[PDB]
Amino acid sequence: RLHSSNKSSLYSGRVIFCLDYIIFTLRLIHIFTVSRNLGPKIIMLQRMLID
Amino acid sequence: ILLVNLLVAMFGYTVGIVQENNDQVWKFQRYFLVQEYCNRLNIPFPFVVFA
C-alpha cells in the first residue's frame, strides 16, 4: 500500500486488504462459541467437513 | 448448499425431539384457551360491546 505514485501497487494493496477482511470477519464465529445456545451448534458445524 | 442443508438437519432433529412431548405440550396449552373462553360470561363477539 505504501508504494505511492503506482496505481498497480495501490490497487493490489487494496485487494490484499479485502481478502484479509474476509479472514478477520470469519474469526467472529470462533469468538461466539461461548453461548449456551450458539455454542453447541457452532461445535456441530465443524463435524460436517467429511460430508 | 451447506448452510441451508445444515438448517434442514437441525429442523429435522428438533422435530424428532419435541414430538413425543408435543402432544403433551399441545394439551397443556389447551388449558389456556379453555380458560379464556370459559371464564367470561360470553355472548357472540360483535354483540359483546353491548354487554
Question: Does the CB of B7 have a partner CB in chain A at under 8 Å?
Answer: no
Q: In sequence order, which residues have a C-beta less than 8 Å from that of residue A30 and are 6 or more positions away?
A: A42
From the list A17, A20, A15, A13, the residue with the least C-alpha distance to A3 is A13
CB atoms within 10 A of CB B40: 10
Q: In sequence order, which residues have a C-beta less than 8 Å from that of residue B20 and are 6 or more positions away?
A: none
Query: Closest approach of chain B CAs to the CA of A30, in angstroms?
Result: 16
Question: Does the CB of B6 have a partner CB in chain A at under 8 Å?
Answer: yes
Q: Which residues of A touch B6 (CB under 8 A)?
A: 45, 48
Question: Does the CB of B15 have a partner CB in chain A at under 8 Å?
Answer: no
DSSP class of residue A47?
A: T
Instruction: Yes or no: say if A38 and A32 are a contact pair by the CB < 8 Å rule.
Output: yes
The residue type of B30 is R
Q: What is the CA radius of gyration of chain A?
A: 18
CB atoms within 10 A of CB A48: 11
Query: Closest approach of chain B CAs to the CA of A17, in angstroms?
Result: 26
As given in the structure block, the three cell numbers for residue B17 are: 425431539
Cross-chain residue pair B2–A41, CB shorter than 8 Å: no
d(CA B4, CA B8): 6
